[PDB]
Amino acid sequence: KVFGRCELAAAMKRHGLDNYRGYSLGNWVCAAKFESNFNTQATNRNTDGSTDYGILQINSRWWCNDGRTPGSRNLCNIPCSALLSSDITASVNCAKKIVSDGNGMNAWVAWRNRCKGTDVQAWIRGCRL
Ligand code: NA
């Protein structure tokens, strides 16, 4: 599924991501924009052999099982394929664990480099939330 900006903002809010660990909804929508362009089916291979999956590009090195990331963990206890579903429940549930790990949303390199410190409220502008 390719989400609309406000469609994804509504979905993230419903699933309790708005101001989760003190990160406003616009930070999450900004992260999703630059990680996946709001595409639930987005996959990208990392240099270390791990893969990033779904709207928030959750890494198989720590968070989900893809069977091909030697020495990796599955801290979200899910198959990485569950992170590509049109239903973002699994991605949001796993994102809550990531953002709670100690470095907040710095875990998302694209959030740090492209969203952090910017006018993230622009990402929910005009949305009926
Ligand atoms: Na893994």
Tab-separated table of C-alpha atoms and ligand atoms in Angstrom:
chain	number	residue	atom	x	y	z
A	1	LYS	CA	0.000	0.000	0.000
A	2	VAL	CA	1.196	3.570	-0.816
A	3	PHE	CA	-0.398	5.696	1.971
A	4	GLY	CA	-1.498	9.277	1.510
A	5	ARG	CA	0.296	11.666	3.932
A	6	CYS	CA	-2.900	12.431	5.993
A	7	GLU	CA	-4.125	8.793	5.628
A	8	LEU	CA	-0.854	7.593	7.250
A	9	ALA	CA	-1.053	10.370	9.931
A	10	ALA	CA	-4.613	9.224	10.885
A	11	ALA	CA	-3.418	5.554	11.024
A	12	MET	CA	-0.313	6.355	13.150
A	13	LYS	CA	-2.484	8.483	15.541
A	14	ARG	CA	-5.098	5.673	15.847
A	15	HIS	CA	-2.258	3.252	16.841
A	16	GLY	CA	-0.997	5.668	19.571
A	17	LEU	CA	2.245	6.918	17.895
A	18	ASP	CA	1.306	10.653	18.217
A	19	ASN	CA	3.626	11.962	21.031
A	20	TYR	CA	4.814	8.388	21.815
A	21	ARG	CA	8.153	8.776	23.754
A	22	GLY	CA	7.440	12.549	23.290
A	23	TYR	CA	7.625	12.427	19.443
A	24	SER	CA	4.775	14.444	17.813
A	25	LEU	CA	2.866	12.876	14.890
A	26	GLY	CA	4.779	14.997	12.300
A	27	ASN	CA	8.120	13.388	13.329
A	28	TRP	CA	6.651	9.899	12.581
A	29	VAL	CA	5.099	10.998	9.239
A	30	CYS	CA	8.416	12.747	8.263
A	31	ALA	CA	10.375	9.540	9.160
A	32	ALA	CA	7.960	7.429	7.047
A	33	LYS	CA	8.217	9.873	4.087
A	34	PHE	CA	12.064	9.648	3.872
A	35	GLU	CA	12.333	5.939	4.908
A	36	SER	CA	9.645	4.484	2.549
A	37	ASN	CA	7.874	7.343	0.677
A	38	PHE	CA	4.796	5.954	2.575
A	39	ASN	CA	5.071	2.550	0.782
A	40	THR	CA	4.316	-0.429	3.147
A	41	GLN	CA	6.104	-2.797	0.627
A	42	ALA	CA	9.491	-0.849	0.740
A	43	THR	CA	12.559	-3.150	1.307
A	44	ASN	CA	16.215	-1.956	1.227
A	45	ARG	CA	19.375	-4.074	1.787
A	46	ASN	CA	21.983	-2.651	4.227
A	47	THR	CA	25.785	-2.964	3.656
A	48	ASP	CA	25.998	-5.393	6.687
A	49	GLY	CA	23.626	-7.897	4.889
A	50	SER	CA	20.581	-6.929	7.045
A	51	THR	CA	17.396	-5.614	5.329
A	52	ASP	CA	15.078	-2.707	6.258
A	53	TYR	CA	11.327	-3.478	5.917
A	54	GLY	CA	8.123	-1.453	5.475
A	55	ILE	CA	6.914	2.132	6.138
A	56	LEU	CA	9.524	2.745	8.906
A	57	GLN	CA	12.328	0.546	7.365
A	58	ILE	CA	12.696	-1.666	10.484
A	59	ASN	CA	16.055	-3.507	10.368
A	60	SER	CA	16.359	-7.368	10.470
A	61	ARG	CA	19.716	-6.927	12.394
A	62	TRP	CA	17.715	-6.469	15.719
A	63	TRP	CA	13.917	-6.250	15.308
A	64	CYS	CA	12.320	-8.869	12.926
A	65	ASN	CA	13.238	-12.313	11.510
A	66	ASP	CA	13.971	-12.659	7.766
A	67	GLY	CA	16.059	-15.899	8.058
A	68	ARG	CA	19.029	-14.368	6.167
A	69	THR	CA	20.651	-11.990	8.726
A	70	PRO	CA	23.393	-14.039	10.486
A	71	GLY	CA	23.758	-13.317	14.229
A	72	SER	CA	20.712	-11.042	14.190
A	73	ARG	CA	17.943	-10.713	16.823
A	74	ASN	CA	14.112	-10.647	16.424
A	75	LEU	CA	13.282	-8.276	19.367
A	76	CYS	CA	9.783	-7.498	17.878
A	77	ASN	CA	9.087	-11.300	17.639
A	78	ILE	CA	7.737	-11.016	14.058
A	79	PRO	CA	8.605	-12.157	10.569
A	80	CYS	CA	10.006	-9.143	8.656
A	81	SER	CA	7.319	-9.865	5.980
A	82	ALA	CA	4.638	-8.830	8.612
A	83	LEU	CA	6.222	-5.304	8.336
A	84	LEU	CA	5.130	-4.992	4.639
A	85	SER	CA	1.361	-5.462	5.304
A	86	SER	CA	-1.180	-2.803	4.198
A	87	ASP	CA	-2.152	-2.851	7.961
A	88	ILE	CA	0.614	-0.910	9.844
A	89	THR	CA	-0.199	-2.426	13.326
A	90	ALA	CA	2.968	-4.630	13.318
A	91	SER	CA	5.220	-1.757	12.087
A	92	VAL	CA	3.842	0.656	14.762
A	93	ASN	CA	4.086	-1.972	17.580
A	94	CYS	CA	7.721	-2.696	16.628
A	95	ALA	CA	8.509	1.094	16.153
A	96	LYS	CA	7.345	1.688	19.795
A	97	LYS	CA	10.015	-0.835	20.957
A	98	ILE	CA	12.750	0.717	18.746
A	99	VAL	CA	12.100	4.334	19.866
A	100	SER	CA	12.132	3.104	23.533
A	101	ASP	CA	15.663	1.525	23.184
A	102	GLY	CA	17.506	4.664	24.503
A	103	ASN	CA	18.355	6.904	21.451
A	104	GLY	CA	14.700	7.844	20.683
A	105	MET	CA	14.104	8.490	16.952
A	106	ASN	CA	17.904	8.804	16.212
A	107	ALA	CA	17.544	5.013	15.546
A	108	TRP	CA	16.150	6.177	12.142
A	109	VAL	CA	19.205	7.697	10.398
A	110	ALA	CA	16.816	9.416	7.848
A	111	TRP	CA	14.851	10.975	10.756
A	112	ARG	CA	18.120	12.316	12.280
A	113	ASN	CA	19.467	13.633	8.936
A	114	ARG	CA	16.184	14.972	7.382
A	115	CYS	CA	13.437	15.475	10.069
A	116	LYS	CA	15.203	16.241	13.376
A	117	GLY	CA	14.980	19.989	14.214
A	118	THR	CA	12.799	20.796	11.140
A	119	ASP	CA	9.186	22.062	10.996
A	120	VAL	CA	7.766	18.494	11.271
A	121	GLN	CA	4.228	19.933	11.947
A	122	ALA	CA	4.161	20.750	8.162
A	123	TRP	CA	3.756	16.930	7.637
A	124	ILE	CA	0.274	16.918	9.325
A	125	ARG	CA	-0.769	20.308	7.809
A	126	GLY	CA	-4.351	20.271	6.421
A	127	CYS	CA	-5.026	16.783	7.898
A	128	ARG	CA	-8.371	16.145	9.632
A	129	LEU	CA	-7.035	14.275	12.712
B	1	NA	NA	16.827	-10.790	12.578
